[PDB]
Amino acid sequence: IVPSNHYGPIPGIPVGSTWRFRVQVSEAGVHRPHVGGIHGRSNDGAYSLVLAGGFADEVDRGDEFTYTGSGGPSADQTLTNMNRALALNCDAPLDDKIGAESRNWRAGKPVRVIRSFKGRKISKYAPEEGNRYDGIYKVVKYWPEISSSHGFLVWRYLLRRDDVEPAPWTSEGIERSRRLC
């Protein structure tokens, strides 16, 4: 229906759609890697990611979350591979030293965000079971941080929801899901 390279909503799969298993999320094309946490191409951008609570308490704020890059914890993370893919979605020239803030955040490339039940103890926005598609998010900004406990650079990303469809935890989103049957 859509290629692997597809940006944005998967047609016929609305916000609030849920799947018991990651393989099913993958089958539906919503987040194609059934193990990898992020789907992207380093020379293009990120298409989807799975959020399971974030790096710390109170990091998932629903409409906004702070995502953490991959790599390392024995080495400085780098703006390569999926880290680079995600940063390319941000509406700003790529900067691998200080990071960048988007000029206009809504103009960024869209990321499909799936919340996993695995973050239910940490995030009030996580589904209580399975996986749920929460819609489109944009990378507002990204920045490097040296961690206090291991002393290596880790990439950090601010994501903010930008979707016409109401978020599943809202009154609108709740009612929409009930109607979809």
UniProtKB/Swiss-Prot annotation:
Induction line: Up-regulated in proliferating fetal lung fibroblasts and in U-937 myeloid leukemia cells. Down-regulated in these cells by growth arrest and differentiation. In other cell types which cannot leave the cell cycle, such as tumoral HT-1080 and Hep-G2, levels are consistently up-regulated.
Residue span(s) of domain YDG: 8-161
Localization (cell): Nucleus; Chromosome
Residues passing through the membrane, by range: none
UniProt PTM comment: May be autoubiquitinated; which may lead to proteasomal degradation.
Coiled-coil residue windows: none
Region annotation (Methyl-CpG binding and interaction with HDAC1) ranges: 1-181
Stated role: E3 ubiquitin ligase that plays important roles in DNA methylation, histone modifications, cell cycle and DNA repair. Acts as a specific reader for 5-hydroxymethylcytosine (5hmC) and thereby recruits various substrates to these sites to ubiquitinate them. This activity also allows the maintenance of 5mC levels at specific genomic loci and regulates neuron-related gene expression. Participates in cell cycle regulation by ubiquitinating cyclins CCND1 and CCNE1 and thereby inducing G1 arrest. Also ubiquitinates PCNP leading to its degradation by the proteasome.
Complex formation: Homodimer; disulfide-linked. Binds methylated CpG containing oligonucleotides. Interacts with H3; the interaction has a preference for the 'Lys-9' trimethylated form of H3 (H3K9me3). Interacts with PCNP. Interacts with HDAC1. Interacts directly with CCNE1; the interaction ubiquitinates CCNE1 and appears independent of CCNE1 phosphorylation. Interacts with CCND1; the interaction ubiquitinates CCND1 and appears independent of CCND1 phosphorylation. Interacts with p53/TP53 and RB1. Interacts with UBE2I. Interacts with ZNF618. Interacts with UHRF1. Interacts with FANCD2. Interacts with ATR.
Domain notes: The YDG domain recognizes and binds 5-hydroxymethylcytosine (5hmC).
Disease: Associated with various cancers. DNA copy number loss is found in multiple kinds of malignancies originating from the brain, breast, stomach, kidney, hematopoietic tissue and lung.
Protein's recorded name: E3 ubiquitin-protein ligase UHRF2
Gene: UHRF2
